Design an enzyme around this catalytic site. Sequence first.
Site, PDB file in Angstrom:
ATOM      1  N   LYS A 137      -3.212 -11.574  -7.098  1.00 18.68           N
ATOM      2  CA  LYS A 137      -3.574 -12.835  -6.462  1.00 18.68           C
ATOM      3  C   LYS A 137      -4.846 -12.709  -5.631  1.00 18.68           C
ATOM      4  O   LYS A 137      -5.253 -11.617  -5.224  1.00 18.68           O
ATOM      5  CB  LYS A 137      -2.438 -13.358  -5.570  1.00 18.68           C
ATOM      6  CG  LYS A 137      -1.192 -13.780  -6.342  1.00 18.68           C
ATOM      7  CD  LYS A 137      -0.001 -13.958  -5.411  1.00 18.68           C
ATOM      8  CE  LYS A 137       0.688 -12.626  -5.127  1.00 18.68           C
ATOM      9  NZ  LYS A 137       1.603 -12.230  -6.238  1.00 18.68           N
ATOM     10  N   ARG A 154       7.852  12.475   3.864  1.00 21.08           N
ATOM     11  CA  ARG A 154       7.335  12.231   5.206  1.00 21.08           C
ATOM     12  C   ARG A 154       7.748  13.325   6.180  1.00 21.08           C
ATOM     13  O   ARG A 154       7.030  13.589   7.153  1.00 21.08           O
ATOM     14  CB  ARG A 154       7.762  10.851   5.708  1.00 21.08           C
ATOM     15  CG  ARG A 154       7.198   9.715   4.863  1.00 21.08           C
ATOM     16  CD  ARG A 154       6.842   8.491   5.691  1.00 21.08           C
ATOM     17  NE  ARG A 154       6.233   7.443   4.870  1.00 21.08           N
ATOM     18  CZ  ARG A 154       4.926   7.192   4.809  1.00 21.08           C
ATOM     19  NH1 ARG A 154       4.069   7.902   5.530  1.00 21.08           N
ATOM     20  NH2 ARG A 154       4.473   6.220   4.027  1.00 21.08           N
ATOM     21  N   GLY A 209       0.820  -0.481   6.053  1.00 19.53           N
ATOM     22  CA  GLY A 209       0.277  -1.681   6.665  1.00 19.53           C
ATOM     23  C   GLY A 209      -0.857  -1.413   7.634  1.00 19.53           C
ATOM     24  O   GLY A 209      -1.727  -2.266   7.823  1.00 19.53           O
ATOM     25  N   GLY A 264      -0.288   1.423  -1.803  1.00 19.42           N
ATOM     26  CA  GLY A 264       0.370   0.484  -2.698  1.00 19.42           C
ATOM     27  C   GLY A 264       0.342   0.894  -4.159  1.00 19.42           C
ATOM     28  O   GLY A 264       0.594   2.054  -4.521  1.00 19.42           O
TER      29      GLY A 264
END
Length: 416
Positions: free
Chosen positions: A215, A39, A396, A373
């Site tokens: 899920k 980063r 996010g 992810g």
Amino acid sequence: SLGNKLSITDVKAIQGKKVLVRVDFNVPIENGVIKDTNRITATLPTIHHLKKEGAAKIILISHCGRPDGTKNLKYTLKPVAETLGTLLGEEVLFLSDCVGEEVAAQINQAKDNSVILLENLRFHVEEEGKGVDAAGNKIKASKEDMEKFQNELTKLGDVFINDAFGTAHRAHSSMVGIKMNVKASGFLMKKELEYFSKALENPQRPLLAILGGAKVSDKIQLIKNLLDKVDKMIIGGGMAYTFKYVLNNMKIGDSLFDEAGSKIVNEIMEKAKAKNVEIYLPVDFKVADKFDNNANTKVVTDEEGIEDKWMGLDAGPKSIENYKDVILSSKTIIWNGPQGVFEMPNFAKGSIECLNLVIEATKKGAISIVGGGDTASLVEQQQKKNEISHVSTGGGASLELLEGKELPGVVALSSK
Ligand SMILES: [Br-]
Ligand SMILES: [K+]
């Protein structure tokens, strides 16, 4: 809108300006040592551009760790200033606070054209708006307190560059409150907005979404929003067994089953019909007798189903063949989820073949976007980052954008 925001390359007046830059420096630190500098390296293009164009001061603000609105030196940004200086080849001045008259005097005293890093914004309760004191009691910043902190940040410089897309989903003081005339994206934010705009605003069609993961429940908002945009959608990975059970009463054995999410499957399929979206679920599966890479395995079709005490862990060969016509005919691809248990090599083939087809379509002119992810991990492990149009690092914020939510830090940027 996402694609009409002013960027650093559009700003004409830089020489002699004090430039305030919001960066993403939320890196892991272990007793003063930074274990992953990716980063920090990522900010070099923005810093170099401002240096070359003659900025009087390059003033960096950021956060790391979990100070929760108090001064907690375990989460000081001091070690980041040392690492950044080594990467730049020059000393970076580190200041102990981020607002106030003493900070301003230290900035003015610094050498012309130099780089300065201010202390962790989240030492102040006013950055997040909420926090918890040392004794553990909740504290809240008043509307007036927030305004004062935002005014103090605004006094630090003349031009604002926001290069922290990964915080832009938050209504925090450094995202919404720096009220300068010029508010522009840095190079990293510019690229995130450029490619998400290409995928979501006027995409070259057919537009395909590839979704996967364990899920259903945590993907409902993402799926429903993308059904308003896409032409086609692949649904795979562990979540697919819940669809096959609800829709076809398929035997699933000991495969993953999402009870809460199962109650929303019919709504998803009914919205796909109403929006004229083609859905592509697997028609066969690689099944295992144990949750283990060394298990005994076989292939079963969706007509056969899965016998008791076996579990499906990857798409089967016919499902993998079905990817070809779907992916290679698409001109924009949004990929958020592996198609099997890719961390186990024997259950990685579905995800690897999906990757190979996305790369082939991109080489022929498609735009491919990977959300983050586990999908980003798959791309990195296969060493194929340069073969995808854009692998987001927004975390996010990228998920909220694909769910259709507003990003306060993007709204606050100047228009082109
Ligand atoms: Br097999
Ligand atoms: K139709």
